């Protein structure tokens with residue numbers, strides 16, 4: 001249905017000329033276009049698949065990005081700037097400013113190697129300052145993942161690292177922005193029950209309701225994947241997910257197990273997971289206590305993992321906020 005209207009050379013709205021593809025998905029694809037009514041400025045256009053789930057999501061996003069671009073005309077809090085929208089061959093299309101590689105794609109194209117700690121520090125601050133901007137405006141992103149954190153420009157320098165014995169890319173400028181607002185939800189809007197699995201919060205898996213706290217859990221999973229270079233919860237089964245958590249973070253709070261509508265996962269108020277099963281032995285040996293993931297014992301590594309630990313607090317009512325986190329000493333090195 002879609003592969004026929006997003007080819008190199010097509011011209012949309014008699015304006016934008018498609019160059020190449022930036023990313024595919026179930027919602028549709030994002031393509032880099034030459035704007036011919038603006039001297040040749042390259043842009044990005046998202047072509048939403050003609051599905052009611054994704055057509056409505058695009059409509060929910062255009063609204064949010066109108067509020068967030070009015071309130072912040074300069075992108076001080078680093079949300080992506082939407083420029084225009086229009087129909088094309090029956091498909092909704094949204095025009096954004098052209099950014100660089102997503103933080104996920106950079107790690108992938110770099111052989112799944114981690115970021116430097118000072119780069120992690122700057123990136124974590126901009127993410128927090130950005131998502132905390134949404135939390136101040138009664139909003140929740142719900143879909144925070146490395147594929148939605150994009151580099152303003154992903155240009156790097158390459159060299160041979162005789163420690164790891166490999167070519168290693170190194171970012172020149174690591175400023176980021178946050179994209180995809182089709183799942184965002186105001187505090188009063190209807191909160192749907194299911195909101196990606198690897199970055200889903202424990203209160204969501206257990207179906208207890210959610211708000212801004214769930215976004216902080218997602219940022220904790222993003223930060224630990226910047227530090228390690230791979231997903232810490234790499235699974236699709238919900239019971240395996242919770243099992244991995246209990247090995248990395250410890251047993252779930254009892255008052256949360258008692259309130260879940262998902263009685264299937266548990267038995268007698270404890271996770272019905274056999275340690276000595278088939279998969280139970282992969283979880284026991286792939287996962288480990290969170291503190292044991294630290295690559296060094298220098299104080300700056302200690303401080304990051306203290307931030308990540310407070311971000312991965314089970315109880316959302318006890319979990320850190322983003323206002324508190326912006327003051328945490330891991331960000332001391334950036335201030336005067």
Ligand SMILES: CNc1ncc2cc3cnccc3c([N+](=O)[O-])c2n1
Nearest residue numbers: 022023030044096097098099179180
């Ligand atoms: C998934 N949602 C979404 N929203 C806005 C986007 C803006 C972009 C701007 N410059 C490059 C890629 C951009 C992508 N992208 O390819 O991922 C976007 N993706």
Ligand SMILES: [K+]
Nearest residue numbers: 191192193194
């Ligand atoms: K629902």
